[PDB]
Ligand binder design. Structure first.
Ligand code: HEM
Length: 154
């Protein structure tokens, strides 16, 4: 699949807003993910002890992790589809070291859309959400293909 320049513009326009507060968006997204799909929390040995949203918000390590994740995702989105090089190491660590099923990538994609919808309604209307979903589907599709080449079905 391929996004048009118009769709990329919608994606990058709302992403520019997210970059005004990467740490904050990172926390909201992971808290949403962990609360909505608690099973994903078990994949993080560093955070699986967190019991409440309050503890999650107060975790300095979780906040730093969120920044690392969103920074990596932002770099991929800014490539506008030409992300082969960026995807290689990400696909290897998540398939081989962390063992993250494609299903879980769908869950975090849902969390990202939910947070952008809540925080940026004016810049995240129907068309913008469709563009973001398409960009994330492309990401998940290419990651899945790499998973297979690497020997991980998940
Ligand atoms: C938007 C998709 C995602 C991106 C861009 C992303 C990115 C990253 C990055 C850059 C790191 C640090 C470097 C590395 O280990 O490769 C990381 C670590 C990790 N990711 Fe992801 N990730 C994504 C989704 C997920 C999901 C859905 C899970 C599982 C629910 C997951 C689990 C992990 C784990 C367990 C680590 C190691 C954390 C640690 O122990 O420090 N990731 N991820």
């Amino acid at each position: 699949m391929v996004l048009s320049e118009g769709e990329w513009q919608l994606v990058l326009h709302v992403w520019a807003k997210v970059e005004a507060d990467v740490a904050g968006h990172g926390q909201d997204i992971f808290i949403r993910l962990f609360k909505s799909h608690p099973e994903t929390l078990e994949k993080f040995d560093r955070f699986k002890h967190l019991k409440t949203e309050a503890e999650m918000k107060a975790s300095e390590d979780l906040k730093k992790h969120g920044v690392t994740v969103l920074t990596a995702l932002g770099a991929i989105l800014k490539k506008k589809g030409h992300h082969e090089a960026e995807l290689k190491p990400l696909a290897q660590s998540h398939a081989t070291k962390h063992k993250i099923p494609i299903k879980y990538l769908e869950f975090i994609s849902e969390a990202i859309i939910h947070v952008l919808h809540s925080r940026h309604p004016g810049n995240f209307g129907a068309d913008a959400q469709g563009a973001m979903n398409k960009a994330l589907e492309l990401f998940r599709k290419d990651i899945a293909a790499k998973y297979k080449e690497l020997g991980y079905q998940g």
